[PDB]
């Protein structure tokens, strides 16, 4: 049965899809994401699918044109968090630890700027905890090497301006504050705006066509079609879109007893928005009948590592059983592990068995301008398509699903 998939997975199709998509970054809600949506829809229609396009609005952020941070009179290197409010505040700097509700209750922040150490709780909550105490701005300092870029997750008027700074620069400020120094800081953020944008999911469904053998089961194969600002997104996640399209073309050649939904999600990089909107469209019957959701994200880089399957809870489920079974016949041992950070989290949240397929450890080009077509491996793309497609077809081929026992290891 695996031969029905492996003789048909065309790695030139997949590379051509990445080449098309990665001519420019596809930031969610932008004209280039809309172009991708149209392209994706056309490809599915070309394989014979009826396609639906689900729109959704979300709050986008335009990054501030000025980010001025000063300690006294010395200017410092500052990165505005995404969704940071504007500010122009000069005031006393107060160290409040990790910024928990505990950490901030005891201190006087009204009118002041909070210095807060990265860790434990969300950037969002650190900002809100300080702002609830009257902080006019928040400086968050790193837990680890290099710059602190990040996000408050979404628009929120409980926030006050929030800027991230190096562990080196913050550790030193925190030391001086602990030592009894009174420090004054300036936090000026200007030109940031929140604006409503519209993104989309592209959904192509193959109804079962096996007559008396047809089951009520559904399998979702997903990827996301947006990329981060300035990243061409060839691997993150044109690769997964390309495997999603290619497997829909392959399955169009075959009888199936299981409904397959091939989906590309919008606004993944914004916090899984499009898969949360698609999961919220499902009825209770659809949720109970969905036997697995396969998420393909970063599945073509020559510079990443071996394939792994990640689940939200680090437990095995039907999708990791099918991925391990297909790999054992095609490639070898396929490990699993625990990780979120992609659209499988939206389906796990409904109780649906779900896993992310990704090459790990990831390449250095992730979320950079160097995430480009010249890092793509056709052989990797083909191997992921053979494994994921054979895992899906193990259930979707006509006849009762059987999974034979197979050990496979958890890897961290």
Ligand X SMILES: CC(C)C[C@H](NC(=O)[C@@H](O)[C@H](N)Cc1ccccc1)C(=O)O
Binding residues: 9, 200, 224, 236, 268-269, 284, 297, 367, 379, 382, 386
How far is Cα of residue 137 from the mean position of the Cα atoms in its chain? 28
**Where would I find the H helices in 154-283?**
167-178, 240-252, 273-279
- 170: alpha, beta or left? (left if phi > 0; alpha if psi -120 to 50): alpha
Of residues 188 and 277, the one with the C-beta less far from Zn ion = 277
Query: Does residue 281 belong to the site contacting its own copies (CB under 8 A)?
Result: yes
| Shortest reach from residue 401's CB to ligand X, in Å | 28
Q: Using CB atoms within 10 A of its CB, is residue 399 exposed (0-12), middle (13-18) or buried (19+)?
A: exposed
What residue 382 binds from its own copies, Zn ion, ligand X, none (CB within 5 to 8 A, per partner kind)? Zn ion
DSSP sequence for 335-401: -EEE--SSTHHHHHTTT--EEEEEEESPPTTTTSTT-SGGGB-HHHHHHHHHHHHHHHHHHHSSS--
Nearer to ligand X, 93 or 298 (CB): 298
* Cα 397 from Cα 255, distance rounded (Å): 7
Of residues 282 and 406, the one with the C-beta less far from its own copies: 282
Is residue 158 part of the contact set for its own copies (CB under 8 A)?
A: yes
Nearest-approach distance from CB 300 to ligand X, in angstroms: 12
Task: Give the full edge-to-edge strand order of the sheet including 51-62.
Answer: 51-62, 193-206, 259-265, 218-224, 290-296, 354-360, 306-311, 336-338
Q: With respect to Zn ion, which residue has the nearer C-beta, 81 or 159?
A: 81
- The three state secondary structure string of 22-77 is CCCCCCCCCHHHHHHHHHHHHHHHHCCCCEEEEEEEEEEEECCCEEEEEECCEEEC
Judged by CB under 5 A, the residue of 32, 237, 246, 345 near Zn ion is 237
Residue nearest to ligand X (CB): 341
Q: Which of 42, 45, 48, 55 forms a contact with Zn ion (CB under 5 A)?
A: 55
Distances (CA, A) of 394 to 43, 274, 401: 25, 28, 7
Q: Which stretch binds its own copies (CB under 8 A): 74-82, 207-215, 235-243, 280-288?
A: 280-288
Please name the residues in contact with 229: beta carbons below 8 A apart, sequence gap of 6 or more: 25, 27
Interacting residues with ligand X (CB under 6 A): 236-237, 268-269, 271-272, 297-298, 339, 341-342, 358, 362
Instruction: In whole angstroms, give the CA distance from residue 177 to residue 20.
Output: 53
Quick one: what does residue 259 bind among Zn ion, its own copies, ligand X, none, with the CB cut-off 5 to 8 Å set by partner type? Answer: none
Q: Which residues are annotated as a binding site for Zn(2+)?
A: 9, 200, 224, 236, 268-269, 284, 297, 367, 379, 382, 386
Which positions from 107 to 146 touch its own copies by CB under 8 A, shown as an x/- string?
A: ---x-----------------x---x-x------------
Binder among 126, 277, 318, 359 for its own copies (CB under 8 A): 277
Report d(CA 277, CA 199) in Å as an integer. Answer: 10
Closer residue to Zn ion in complex, CB, 8/188: 8
358 binds, among ligand X, Zn ion, its own copies, none (CB under 5 to 8 A by kind): ligand X
Size of the site for Zn ion (CB under 5 A): 9
Q: How far is the CB of 36 from its own copies (least distance, A)?
A: 15
DSSP state for residue 312 in the 8-state scheme: T
Question: Contact at 8 Å (CB) between 160 and 85?
Answer: yes
Per CB under 8 A, does 282 bind its own copies?
yes
CA 290 and chain centroid, separation: 21
**What residues line the site for Zn ion (CB under 5 A)?**
6, 9, 55, 236-237, 297, 379, 382, 386
**What residues line the site for its own copies (CB under 8 A)?**
52-56, 110, 128, 132, 134, 157-158, 200, 203, 277, 280-287
């Amino acid at each position: 049965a695996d031969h029905q998939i492996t003789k048909r997975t065309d790695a030139e199709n997949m590379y051509n899809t990445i080449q098309f998509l990665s001519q420019a970054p596809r930031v969610a809600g932008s004209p280039e994401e809309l172009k991708a949506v149209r392209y994706i829809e056309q490809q599915f229609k070309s394989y014979g699918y009826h396609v639906e396009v689900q729109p959704f609005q979300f709050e986008g952020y335009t990054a501030p044109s000025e980010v001025t941070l000063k300690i006294g009179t010395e200017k410092k290197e500052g990165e505005a968090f995404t969704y940071s409010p504007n500010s122009d505040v000069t005031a006393e700097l107060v160290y409040v630890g990790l910024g928990t509700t505990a950490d901030v209750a005891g201190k006087d922040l009204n009118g002041k700027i909070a210095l807060i150490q990265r860790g434990n709780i969300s950037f969002a909550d650190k900002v809100r905890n300080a702002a609830k105490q009257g902080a006019k701005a928040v400086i968050i300092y790193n837990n680890t090497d290099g710059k602190l870029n990040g996000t408050l997750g979404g628009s929120d008027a409980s926030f006050v301006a929030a800027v991230g700074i190096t562990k080196q620069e913050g550790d030193a400020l925190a030391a001086n504050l602990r030592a009894g120094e009174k420090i004054t800081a300036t936090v000026k953020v200007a030109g940031a705006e929140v604006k409503t944008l519209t993104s989309h999911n592209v959904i192509a469904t193959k109804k079962p066509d096996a007559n008396k053998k047809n089951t009520n089961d559904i399998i979702i194969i997903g990827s996301h079609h947006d990329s981060v600002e300035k990243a061409p997104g060839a691997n993150d996640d044109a690769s997964g879109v390309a495997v999603t399209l290619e497997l829909a073309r392959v399955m169009s050649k075959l009888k199936t007893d299981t409904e397959l939904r091939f989906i590309t999600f919008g606004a993944e990089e914004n916090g899984l928005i499009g898969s949360k909107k698609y999961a919220a469209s499902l009825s209770e019957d659809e949720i109970k009948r969905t036997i697995g959701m396969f998420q393909l994200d970063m599945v073509g880089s020559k510079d990443a590592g071996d394939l792994i399957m990640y689940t939200i809870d680090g437990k095995k489920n039907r999708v990791t059983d099918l991925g391990a079974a297909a790999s054992s016949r095609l490639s070898g041992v396929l490990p699993y592990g625990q990780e979120g950070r992609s659209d499988h989290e939206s389906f796990h949240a409904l109780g649906i068995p779900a896993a992310l397929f990704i090459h790990a450890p990831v390449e250095p080009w992730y979320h950079t301008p160097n995430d480009t077509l010249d890092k793509i491996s056709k052989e990797k793309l083909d191997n992921v398509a053979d494994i994921v497609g054979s895992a899906v077809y193990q259930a979707a081929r006509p006849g009762e699903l059987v999974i034979e026992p197979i050990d496979y290891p958890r890897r961290n």
